[PDB]
Design a protein around this ligand. Structure first.
Ligand SMILES: O=c1ccn([C@@H]2O[C@H](COP(=O)(O)OP(=O)(O)O[C@H]3O[C@H](CO)[C@@H](O)[C@H](O)[C@H]3O)[C@@H](O)[C@H]2O)c(=O)[nH]1
Ligand SMILES: [Zn+2]
Ligand SMILES: [Zn+2]
Ligand SMILES: [Zn+2]
Ligand SMILES: [Zn+2]
Ligand SMILES: [Zn+2]
Ligand SMILES: [Zn+2]
Ligand SMILES: [Zn+2]
Lengths: 485, 105, 105, 485
């Protein structure tokens, strides 16, 4: 049966293929090839699961603390190591979570600087001070490729070599019937709902086919540093780099991932285990529902994955050449506005850590993991709680306590326009610890938020926090409207 | 008399020279402010009224520390409702109304 | 101190070995809870607070038996209103407001 | 230890005794004796004292279906068989639950008729139609005796001989001390603080000591019919009486209780079993630890006790003068005015069934089990749903379905006073199945309720149902004030 399914899907896929402008046909074919392999693997095994008996906690030498690395000290010549590195940023996504139409990378983060501006500023400044020439590679998506290339012109005078390569594009496949939903139409058909970016993970296949890893490996590059464009913490670290290109005892690590300690918040997943001799990234979906609670337990697994990864180009080429590169199949289900239940197969770049030799984890501070998922984060990042230089944000020296406060703005704030609208100015959050804003709320200028502030406005009601307002350990509720006279 | 609107020296009150215009502002505090005890308790400190013209406050109203009142301010808390003006709040030419409670934590 | 967050022996309290994170959570019950009689009255049983981090209870609130409070729970009931958190209720990172009354049938 | 403490308590009770009424002095001790016996007995058996093994379901013909008795059931002569019977009603209860002090019997149930009025009416009409002389007897309490004897002047001209006897009153006992609560203030400090009725068991002890037992057995009475005045259903059944005084094969039954099938509501009562060769009434309390959940199971035990009993006076005398009457000690606890925690010992009349020869239950229809405990039951009984004839209520023949409808009135309706005030007339409930009313609700004249009706007036809100309103399968909520003009 299964074979008949596969072959039945694929020749239909061949039919889809027949539709193509020649412009981007051959590049379409590959993607289909890629998908199909994913699909061949998809039905190779079902109910993807791991033998919990064979799992183990990683050895203490397999996940080293960042302070030891930093202890060792930065490298003797920064230039010669920076020239062996290439920065890669994931740009597959857009600001729909933040209620913006365009690619996320473009949403303004601080003082008219967008995420991309910040990355560019970083690497540029890096080059300018160390008189080196680091590249920036942006892994775009079909949703962002074009929207993104348009604005790359701004960085002509800024001192960095920005590249680009499009992620794959796979057909969404119906849930009940394991067939593709595509009507053999191109991107322009408004059938964009029938396609998807497989994974942050296919980057191996996408980066190989782009031919940039051969350019770069030929250009004398040893390592790529992958991160997200929204993760403001993912700076290029000279200590980690030093531990990479000047390895002690000659241990070349092909694949090293930054992990960090778990808060009760971020239990989400992405914790390293020792499975069958090598490190493996284990996700909750992989764990049986019998040991799912034990997996979340912070005694047994203290850390999780920040998708800040340093990988060796060489190993990528070697492994991709052999299709030995191995990642679990994420079968993601979705139901979109059209009213259609579909699944879409994908993979996570981290999961491949099990196919590389001498794979390593390093437990970096949370400082290196500041994802800006939503507008509440934006509020942190814009406030005097943080300080920006050379496109790099660091916590304020004037922050009395080292922790990052907690801030949850409601649905009224979800869209950036609304967020900006509702804050006359960004309030003083230097002494802040907890902040909960729920209903319809507005903030005048020079508000000051200290400690635990819970402003709550009920449904229908609205709260206008007057300017100059100092809220320190207050819980403020009701319905107040301030009007002009 | 208690505000920075007047300066006190050797018992003698004189309207602050800093006052832009020699006119004395109009202020009407509601029933909840009639008794000196309530009044005192309801103003955590005497606000900045140096740029005040009209102040009308009616109902259950509370002032935090350092409030600044400028020009025309009307604060109307209806029956049953209360209004807690947070501290440092500067109100300039505004009518503020509704039901807002500010509790400690 | 009454919750399973803590363990008592020989008149000595120590934090539960089962507390996943070493910190003590934060809990602020309102004025309705201030008096011990009221506090005891309003908690049918002491809820599970082993996974709790922040807890803010403000207005008139009651808790049935076997409520479970995890992470950040902000229950808020407005003036006049009342909230009856039903028994067995699991509140994890929720902010719950309004006016709900549960009555016997 | 236990005995040493018992005698210590006995001394105290003697210290109690030395104070008493000259005229009512002596019997107090008789009551008191009963008390110690109870104390001795309750310490004699500490714990479950009953296994789970020896219990078995009653065999068929342990309990006979009422339908089988009513078959060719009416006696050829109804006078003679009625002349041998005496009707006893349990009147040791107040209407505090319905928000009145007076004995519950004195609360007006239908058309100004009280429970008593109904009973008196019934047997009076019996006497008047069958030219017989049936006695009525009330088991009173120290809470109802005087109050009942005051109003018994009413039935002077009504053709029925009404008698009265007061059950024992025992001193409450402290939970920790195991000594009499004994505030003895003196009784000026009220009894509830000071004394209690043993619940239903005493009936045998006090009915003997009253001399009415000897009176009636000597007057020519063979059987005694016990039930509650609040159980409107418990009428004198001539069929049961016929199967009783004219038994087949001349097998006389000394004790017979009416049981009925368990609805979902009545799964909390005690049930009939066969234990150690004889029928016995078993209680939840009697079933400690394991096997508890099964007792409730309607699959195992399908019937429960209506407390509508028929007993032989001869048997009662024979067994009482031998002290062979055995009932399972029941221990209950609470306190309020005292600000104490207190224990009181009592027994159950139904439990004694085991100490009788030829004990025989019968499964009567719910028609005979209609306990009016709340105003919600009054509304039900006062409505056209039931028809009244000579103190006897019978469900309307117009009622399409035999089932009784569910009605629940709110806290505003608990007190009969408020309840009466809130209904300008009893609405039509003949096509009613389900009625729920909550909050400040009022009903005009000639309202008609059909099917399911839910009326919710939230806190602060009032709902005035306008008169003549017909509500059928509606849920009405809101806030409506109907005023006069
Ligand atoms: O197929 C995709 C989807 C998204 N992106 C880009 O990467 C981000 C997607 O990641 P995010 O939405 O930030 O969360 P996750 O996909 O879980 O991936 C990373 O970011 C999370 C932030 O919480 C971390 O928790 C995860 O460990 C980390 O792998 C977006 O900003 C996109 O620009 C891609 O390159 N390819
Ligand atoms: Zn193209
Ligand atoms: Zn925008
Ligand atoms: Zn204060
Ligand atoms: Zn029979
Ligand atoms: Zn009774
Ligand atoms: Zn009469
Ligand atoms: Zn009343």
């Amino acid at each position: 049966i299964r074979q008949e399914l596969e072959l039945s899907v694929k020749k239909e896929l061949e039919k889809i293929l027949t539709t193509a402008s020649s412009h981007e046909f051959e590049h379409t074919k590959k993607d289909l090839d890629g998908f199909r392999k994913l699909f061949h693997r998809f039905l190779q095994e079902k109910g993807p699961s791991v033998d919990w008996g064979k799992i183990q906690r990683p050895p203490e030498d397999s996940i080293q603390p960042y302070e030891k690395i930093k202890a060792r000290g930065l490298p003797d010549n920064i230039s010669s190591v920076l020239n062996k590195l290439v920065v890669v940023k994931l740009n597959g996504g857009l600001g729909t979570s933040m209620g913006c139409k365009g690619p996320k990378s473009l949403i303004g983060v601080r003082n008219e600087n967008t995420f991309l501006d910040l990355t560019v500023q970083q690497i540029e400044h890096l080059n300018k001070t160390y008189n080196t020439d680091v590249p920036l590679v942006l892994m775009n998506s079909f949703n962002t490729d074009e929207d993104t290339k348009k604005i790359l012109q701004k960085y002509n005078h800024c001192r960095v070599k920005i590249y680009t390569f499009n992620q794959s594009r796979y057909p969404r496949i119906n849930k009940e019937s394991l067939l593709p939903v595509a009507k053999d139409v191109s991107y322009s058909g408004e059938n964009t709902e029938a396609w998807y970016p497989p994974g942050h993970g296919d980057i191996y296949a996408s980066f190989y086919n782009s031919g940039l890893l051969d350019t770069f490996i030929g250009e004398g590059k040893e390592y790529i540093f992958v991160s997200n464009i929204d993760n403001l913490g993912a700076t290029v670290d000279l200590y980690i780099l030093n531990h990479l290109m000047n390895p002690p005892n000659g241990k070349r690590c092909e694949f090293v991932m930054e992990v960090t300690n778990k808060t009760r918040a971020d239990v989400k997943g992405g914790t390293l285990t020792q499975y069958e001799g090598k490190l493996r990234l284990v996700e909750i979906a992989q764990v049986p529902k019998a040991h799912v609670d034990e997996f979340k337990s912070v005694s047994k697994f203290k850390i999780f994955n920040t998708n800040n990864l340093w990988i060796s180009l060489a190993a990528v080429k070697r492994l991709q050449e052999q299709n030995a590169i191995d990642m679990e199949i994420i079968v993601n289900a979705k139901t979109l506005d059209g009213g259609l239940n579909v699944i879409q197969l994908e993979t996570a770049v981290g999961a491949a850590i099990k196919s590389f030799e001498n794979s390593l984890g390093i437990n970096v501070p949370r400082s290196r993991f500041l994802p800006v998922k939503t507008t509440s984060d934006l509020l942190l990042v814009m406030s005097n709680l943080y300080s920006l230089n050379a496109g790099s944000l660091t916590m304020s020296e004037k922050r009395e306590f080292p922790t990052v406060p907690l801030v949850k703005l409601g649905s009224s704030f979800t869209k950036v326009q609304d967020y900006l609208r509702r804050f006359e100015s960004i309030p003083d959050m230097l002494e802040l610890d907890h902040l909960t804003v729920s209903g319809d709320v507005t903030f005048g200028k020079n508000v000051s938020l200290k400690g635990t502030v819970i402003i709550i406005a009920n449904h229908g009601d609205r709260i206008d926090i007057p300017p100059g307002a100092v809220l320190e350990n207050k819980i403020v509720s009701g319905n107040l409207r301030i009007l002009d006279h």
